[PDB]
A = this chain, B = another copy of it.
Amino acid sequence: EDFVDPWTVQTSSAKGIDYDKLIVRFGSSKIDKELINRIERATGQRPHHFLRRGIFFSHRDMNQVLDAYENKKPFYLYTGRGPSSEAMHVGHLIPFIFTKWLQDVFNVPLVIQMTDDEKYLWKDLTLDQAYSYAVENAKDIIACGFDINKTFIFSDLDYMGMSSGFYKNVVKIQKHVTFNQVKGIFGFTDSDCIGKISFPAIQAAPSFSNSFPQIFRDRTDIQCLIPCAIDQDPYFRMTRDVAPRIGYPKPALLHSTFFPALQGAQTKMSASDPNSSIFLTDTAKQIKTKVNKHAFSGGRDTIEEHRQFGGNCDVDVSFMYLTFFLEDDDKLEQIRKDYTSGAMLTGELKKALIEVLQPLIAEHQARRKEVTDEIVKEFMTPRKLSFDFQ
């Protein structure tokens, strides 16, 4: 009942998908209180709200990452973006917001893959468009605050032709994965182009440190941690499988839930449905309108009934959004209590969310405007990142 994969995301329950059942089906492990406390201990920092609230709820070998970090051994962060267009919605920002926190708390180098080739193979795009979207989307990623001296954002199309180690790993991986394997993992068929069939190796490749010689200089032992939306897991479930078969360490994973579509947690927000998403370029006006008109309500139909019986936070999309963006834990709790008791009407809850998203988006736009051509260029230039590994 919780179908999930690299592109599509379906579920049939207003409360969202059953992530506990998904963990089991994926074979990953749940992020428990014990692990959350160990992360706090290891770092000396209070865990990000995404972890406290179960937004990042699943993982693979995080224990290993914590071991390595506790023993002063290095590890690096790796995440990515499919640049399907210049238009990005708030849902896309979840993993990046978290990765930025990860990079600050652990203080480690970050690698961000821009799959312009992926999007070229799958969508009706020109190479220039695809590449252009990677560069434009990179500005939105840089707007999240990543340290220019600790992070390399790269275009597949560009980097493939300027790395003495990337393509090499891509081939090693290509040899250790069959068509049957990828047909079962991603659902490919005989009619798909050969580019799609072999693509997974591209996305698997950045999991190995020697893919970035200008960063790790031939070392093949640095632990890799991949924070991503749960639906990306099949790429790395595959990656973890081949790693050993080719003498490389398995990458660790940190999974996040889906950011809800405006009409209900049954679907994730997707540009493939603009009415379901809030875009990073939406005006203050459009944000208010989308929330007021499209945000599914867990409250009662009439205000009288709402006062009498109170609302249901478990299916209310507006409350769900506050869960992702309202940092103050007490403020959120009060709203939960007041909404549940009917003390707060959905219209007010709605107003509350709007007052949170508008500044968030307006601020992101302000930051994005600050990334100049020279800045994007540097971020996207293979180079050494203030960190010595040898």
List residues of chain A with CB under 8 Å of any chain B CB: 117, 120-121, 127, 157, 160-168, 171-172, 174-180, 182-183, 188-195, 197-198, 200-201
Contact = CB atoms under 8 A, between A and B. Distances in A.
Contacts of A127: 168, 171-172
A64 to B, nearest CB: 27
Q: Interface on chain A toward B: helix, strand, loop, or mixed SS?
A: helix
Contacts of A178: 190-194
Contact of A198 (B157, B160, B183, B198): B198
B198 A195 contact: yes
Given A127-B171, A172-B127, A174-B121, A190 B183 contact: yes
19 contacts: A120-B171, A121-B174, A121-B175, A161-B163, A161-B166, A161-B167, A161-B168, A171-B195, A174-B194, A176-B193, A178-B191, A179-B179, A179-B191, A179-B192, A179-B193, A183-B190, A194-B198, A194-B201, A197-B198
Given A174-B193, A176-B193, 8 more contacts: A121-B174, A127-B171, A157-B171, A175-B193, A179-B192, A179-B194, A195-B201, A197-B197
B180 A190 contact: yes
A315 to B, nearest CB: 41
Contacts of A163: 161
A75 to B, nearest CB: 25
7 nearest CB pairs, A to B: A174-B195, A194-B198, A198-B198, A160-B167, A180-B190, A161-B167, A179-B190
A239 to B, nearest CB: 13
A217 B194 CA distance: 28
Nearest to A157: B168
A180 B189 CA distance: 9
Nearest to A174: B195
A155 to B, nearest CB: 11
A254 B193 CA distance: 28
Contacts of A162: 161-162, 164
Given A175-B120, A179-B179, A190-B178, A164 B161 contact: yes
